């Protein structure tokens, strides 16, 4: 018997997920709860002790956590494949430029990544959404609302009739990596540490 | 010119969105920041005047609101296909006892109601996944985790080789409605107020 609780940034909520299948099936005493949030939130989650693990890209800076990688998490371009830049390769960043561009909520690692690499770049784009949620974007893309970058998780969705497209934008994918991490110095329930072990081991050699 | 503020509900995450695209082409000026909650969160943000507009389902108890129905939002029951009712018709209530059966998590309007329900039918499920995301309980349905009761509206993304399905069980679907809602009172901005009523003339007679 016990009772795991994860709370994982936005992008690990279909992968998480089908990881738990195979470990429940393991474990049928295991009872799990998972919390599903972006960066911001989580810190405070963290600071309040919440939780067993945490699945985080960006380790928040006023937090001592232990952490390992376990999968890449890279950032991707999307558009709708009737841009004019679909399908085209080698496209410098300042093509993006006053593009028509969806932003996650404040908050997002995934906006503080883009905001950063635009910034560094010398990259204005054009945002008139702030949209709190992958779906929600991929949505909007697909209704011609703009581009955005995504976890390229978010797009293990897609299928069939996908409107959505990766644009081969230089600088990305923004390198960026999923972690298991826990409070540092933290104890860890044996369940815990099984299922830390248990997620280390089925992802060892994995691509993305 | 001007900045909306939206705050809905997890399941209007897919339409919600794609009905802001035909109106910030009519509306070219407008900024609109969307944010994605459950309906815990959501009274939390109503309590702290966050928005112009709320999207829920059932109203928070303790809060004055002002609103509109706009759209049904019929909660169902969810399986994979390979489940033994899958495809069958009529099925009583009763079906359901001590089915693997996953949860959303505290906080969520979809398992208040589907608790209220199982409790005035002495219902009983075998719950051992509570899973904070409708994406992250159609991923653990998808892997063979046991069946749940979400948002039709959740099933929009749902094409080609989808593994799910509605099972056809009593009671269900659990009727419910999107409502459009502001703080009692509260005087509109001239935004917020063209919006609502783009809102309520775009979904007058719509099916779901």
Redo the contacts between chains.
């Keep these: 018997q016990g009772r795991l609780r994860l709370a994982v940034i936005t992008t690990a909520?279909?992968f998480?997920?089908?990881l738990?299948?195979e470990f429940?099936q393991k474990y049928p005493g295991?009872?799990?709860?998972?919390?599903?949030t972006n960066h911001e939130q989580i810190r405070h989650r963290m600071q309040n002790n919440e939780d067993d693990l945490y699945i985080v890209s960006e380790p928040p800076e006023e937090i001592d956590l232990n952490y390992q990688p376990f999968l890449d998490n890279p950032l991707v371009v999307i558009a709708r494949r009737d841009h004019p830049l679909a399908g085209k390769s080698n496209i410098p960043i300042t093509a993006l430029n006053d593009e028509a561009f969806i932003m996650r909520?404040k908050g997002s690692g995934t906006r503080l990544a883009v905001q950063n690499l635009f910034h560094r770049h010398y990259v204005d784009v054009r945002?008139?959404?702030?949209?709190?949620?992958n779906?929600?974007?991929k949505?909007?893309i697909?209704?011609?609302?703009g581009i955005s970058v995504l976890s390229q998780h978010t797009l293990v969705?897609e299928?069939?009739?996908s409107e959505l497209t990766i644009l081969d934008i230089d600088e990305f994918p923004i390198k960026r990596r999923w972690y298991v991490a826990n409070l540092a110095g933290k104890q860890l329930s044996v369940i815990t540490q099984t299922f830390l072990d248990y997620l280390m081991a089925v992802t060892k050699n994995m691509p993305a």
Tied chains: 1, 2.
């Design positions: 909520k279909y998480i997920p089908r738990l299948g429940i295991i009872e799990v709860s998972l919390k599903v909520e945002v008139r959404l702030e949209l709190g949620s779906e929600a974007i949505q909007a697909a209704g011609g609302m969705s299928g069939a009739r």
